[PDB]
């Protein structure tokens, strides 16, 4: 892993802590680690 989840990936809901640490931001239906 790149210390968090790399850019472009799914992510659990933000809620309980963005591990994409850039952001785990909602795209249409589901989370995405994204530059946002």
Same mark, same amino acid.
């Not at 989840?5 to 995405?32: A, M, Q, S, T």
């Given at each position: 892993g790149? *210390? !968090?989840? +790399?850019?472009? +990936?799914?992510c =659990?809901? =933000? $809620?309980e802590?963005?591990?994409?640490?850039? %952001? !785990?931001v909602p +795209?249409? %239906?589901?989370f *995405? !680690? $994204?530059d946002?």
């Amino acid at each position: 892993g790149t *210390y !968090c989840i +790399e850019l472009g +990936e799914r992510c =659990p809901n =933000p $809620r309980e802590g963005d591990w994409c640490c850039h %952001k !785990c931001v909602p +795209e249409g %239906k589901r989370f *995405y !680690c $994204r530059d946002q």
